[PDB]
Amino acid sequence: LTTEQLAKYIDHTNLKADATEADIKQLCDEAKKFNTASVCVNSYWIPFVTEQLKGTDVNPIAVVGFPLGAMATESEIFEATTAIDQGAEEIDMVLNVGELKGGNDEKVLADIQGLADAVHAKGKILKVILENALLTKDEIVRACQLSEKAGADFVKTSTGYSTSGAKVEDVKLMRETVGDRLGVKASGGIHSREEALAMIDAGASRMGVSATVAILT
Amino acid sequence: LTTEQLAKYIDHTNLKADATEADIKQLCDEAKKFNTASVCVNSYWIPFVTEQLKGTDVNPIAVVGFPLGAMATESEIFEATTAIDQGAEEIDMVLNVGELKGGNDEKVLADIQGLADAVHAKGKILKVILENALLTKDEIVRACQLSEKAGADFVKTSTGYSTSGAKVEDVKLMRETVGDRLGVKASGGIHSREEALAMIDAGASRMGVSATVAILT
Numbered sequence A, B: 001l002t003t004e005q006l007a008k009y010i011d012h013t014n015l016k017a018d019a020t021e022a023d024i025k026q027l028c029d030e031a032k033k034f035n036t037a038s039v040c041v042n043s044y045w046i047p048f049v050t051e052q053l054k055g056t057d058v059n060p061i062a063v064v065g066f067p068l069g070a071m072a073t074e075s076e077i078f079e080a081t082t083a084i085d086q087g088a089e090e091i092d093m094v095l096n097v098g099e100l101k102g103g104n105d106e107k108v109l110a111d112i113q114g115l116a117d118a119v120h121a122k123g124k125i126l127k128v129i130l131e132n133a134l135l136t137k138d139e140i141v142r143a144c145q146l147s148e149k150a151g152a153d154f155v156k157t158s159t160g161y162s163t164s165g166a167k168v169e170d171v172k173l174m175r176e177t178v179g180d181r182l183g184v185k186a187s188g189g190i191h192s193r194e195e196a197l198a199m200i201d202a203g204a205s206r207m208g209v210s211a212t213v214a215i216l217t
Helices: A003-009 A021-034 A043-052 A073-085 A097-101 A105-121 A137-149 A168-178 A193-202 A212-216 B003-007 B021-034 B043-053 B073-085 B097-101 B105-121 B137-150 B168-178 B193-202 B212-216
Strands: A010-013 A038-041 A059-063 A090-094 A125-129 A154-156 A183-187 A206-209 B010-013 B038-041 B059-063 B090-094 B125-129 B154-156 B183-187 B206-209
Touching: A003 A010, A003 A193, A003 A212, A010 A021, A010 A183, A010 A212, A021 A038, A021 A043, A021 A212, A021 B097, A038 A043, A043 A059, A043 A073, A059 A073, A073 A090, A073 A105, A073 B073, A090 A105, A097 A105, A097 A137, A097 B021, A105 A125, A105 A137, A125 A183, A137 A154, A137 A168, A168 A183, A168 A193, A193 A206, A193 A212, B003 B193, B003 B212, B010 B021, B010 B183, B010 B212, B021 B038, B021 B043, B021 B212, B038 B043, B043 B059, B043 B073, B059 B073, B073 B090, B073 B105, B090 B105, B097 B105, B097 B137, B105 B125, B105 B137, B125 B137, B125 B183, B137 B154, B137 B168, B154 B168, B168 B183, B168 B193, B193 B206, B193 B212
Parallel strands: A010 A038, A010 A206, A038 A059, A059 A090, A090 A125, A125 A154, A154 A183, A183 A206, B010 B038, B010 B206, B038 B059, B059 B090, B090 B125, B125 B154, B154 B183, B183 B206
Antiparallel strands: none
């Protein structure tokens, strides 16, 4: 992998609650310099990011109902479609972990399906963050299968706000579960080019990374 | 302060991403047993909580754009108006910390003001979480002033998702800044009855508490 083709795996990310406009501008400057796949931000920053990335192939993407995944489905849908209308090309949602843990699979499915249908209506794609740190291994598998059934385009490991992030063994399990039918995005705790390559070898087709500069240089 | 009157200060809270329906039912059972002021949950659980608390003196309340405070204002408004319509009597929003730190006071104001307009149109009240952990003491003061100017009813210390929560000196500083014109809600890390009384003594008129059973028994 070239640095230039490694960059294409990368959603360059800053989701910190204290990120300033200058921080987000820097995020965009870095993404443009290395030509990453995306810049990933909280929904408030989508108009600014879209402006900063105008005329480049770097995509603004937004997280929604993030990081807790416990927002009413209708409210997640509105956050997502509003973000798309403002420039988001992809939406990274969070699984309703509480309903998954509770075994209420029909409610988990309806939540992801609502987002998938709305995002696809706009012609965009949806990733589902499972938050692996909070899940049993059987739950990771079930969450992947529900994500696929509901029409999600990617499953994603982590928000960065739980007790751990991407683990190679979890990435493998996800990739085995969804086969080549969904993308797999590894996120949380990826700090080096070595770790990035290891996630790709485990099965990741995209990565969420804040340490992009260190990684590509 | 008896246990009954201490309970009236308390918004009994479970906002964990992995909270199940059974966990939220227990949260409601506990609030009804101790007759707390409120039950505070993420917006997904508002219909359920409202049904559980029907016929009692305990108010459902919801967090919005939580815990990062970086959700687009229009989307926060949708989440808040939906939550109130579904049974929430108060809304606890999060400050746009990034805009405050970047000195964009006009944008901080517009964000809170929009929520205040929506919440007040429905006859309810709005709290603004400052996330004191991420602020300088000058920033805590300015955030209180902007919250008051935007029409907020309460300033609130913390989300519980940052590096620290309620501190007595911060609560005192907040109360000095808003005087008796807004309420002050201490939240995050309140573990014991002693600590709860200390927060009240420091100027808190409401507290966000998740370890409520231990505090009241």
